C-alpha cells in the first residue's frame with residue numbers, strides 16, 4: 490500500500506503512481522493513474538468518521554455530485570473504501586484532475602478581460618445547473634474553482650451545499666456562519682441563514698471583483714468587519730432596503746453608522762470593462778431580493794459572446810435529501826456513507 494507524505498493512501502490496484510496535490514481540514518488529494526481508463530485522475534482521501542461535521546460535509550457532497558452531471562461541475566466517477574463498515578476507516582473519491590485553480594492564478598497571473606469574461610460565464614453556467622436542482626453551493630470562492638491548461642472551469646467542494654429553503658432563511662443579528670468570510674453576503678451578518686440562491690450570487694460577485702484587481706474586494710478580518718467592508722464600498726443602505734430588515738437589532742446597528750457614500754465601481758476598477766462593472770453592481774446588490782439571478786446574469790450584455798440558453802442545461806429534477814443531516818450522530822452518518830458508496834464496490 491503506497492502512501493503520500495506520511496499518510497496511508499490505499500487505492501490500488503486500479504489507481505497507482507500517486508503524487509501529492511493538496512491537503513484539507515480532514516482529507517488529502519493526490520493525482521493517480523487510472524489503469525482502467527488509462528488516464529490520470531484526482532483522488533480525495535477522506536477521514537471524517539471522528540467528527541459529525543466532517544461526516545455531514547462528506548455525505549452531502551457524495552449525494553449531490555453523484556446526481557449532478559455538468560461540464561462546469563466536478564464529478565465523482567468512482568469511490569474506493571473497505572468492503573465492510575467495520576474495516577472502513579477512510580473514503581476515497583475519484584474526481585476530475587485539473588492543473589490549477591482560480592486562487593493560484595490570481596496570486597500571480599493578470600487576467601485579460603476575455604479571460605475574466607470566459608471564467609465568469611462558466612461559473613454562472615455551472616451555477617445555473619446547481620440552482621435548477623434547487624441546490625445552493627454556499628462556499629463559492631476562487632480556491633473552489635478548478636481550471637485546466639485550456640482554462641476550462643469546474644466548481645468543486647459541495648461540503649456546505651444545501652437545498653434551498655427561502656421560507657426558513659430569517660434569523661437574528663450576528664448569527665454565526667460557517668462559509669468563507671470574504672465571500673459572505675451582507676445579510677448573513679444581519680438576518681439570513683444563507684438558505685436562498687441569492688447568497689451564491691453575492692459570492693460570484695466577489696469573485697468577479699477579485700478577478701478584476703487580483704485581490705479580494707471585501708477582506709474582512711473578523712465577523713462584523715466583513716459587513717463594514719461591504720458598507721464601505723456600497724454605502725449606507727437606502728431607506729427601502731432598511732425597511733426590509735425587520736429585526737430591530739440588525740436595523741438599529743445599520744442606523745447607528747455614519748452616512749457613507751457609494752464608492753463608484755469605475756473608481757475601484759479603472760481598467761475594467763464597463764459592461765463587467767454593470768453586472769458586478771447587480772450581483773453585489775445589498776438587498777438580496779433585488780440581487781440579480783443566475784439566469785438573468787447569463788443574459789447580461791457582458792456575456793453576450795457566450796450566452797446561449799439552449800447550451801446551458803438544467804438538472805432533470807430538483808434535489809431532495811431523504812432525511813435532515815443536521816441532527817444525526819457520526820455513527821449513523823458512517824452507515825449512510827457506506828450505503829451511498831456501495832454501488833462502486835466490485836461486488
Ligand SMILES: CCOC(=O)CNCc1ccc(-c2cn[nH]c2-c2c[nH]c(C(=O)N[C@H](CO)c3ccc(F)c(Cl)c3)c2)cc1Cl
Nearest residue numbers: 511512513514515516517518531584585586587633645646
Ligand atoms: C482545504 C482545501 O484544500 C486545500 O488545502 C487547497 N486546495 C488545494 C487543491 C487544489 C486542487 C486540487 C485538485 C486538482 N485536481 N482536482 C482537484 C480536486 C479534486 N477534488 C477536490 C476537492 O474536493 N477540493 C475541496 C476544496 O475545494 C476539498 C474538500 C475537502 C478536503 F479535505 C480537501 Cl483536501 C479538498 C479538488 C486539490 C486540492 Cl486539495
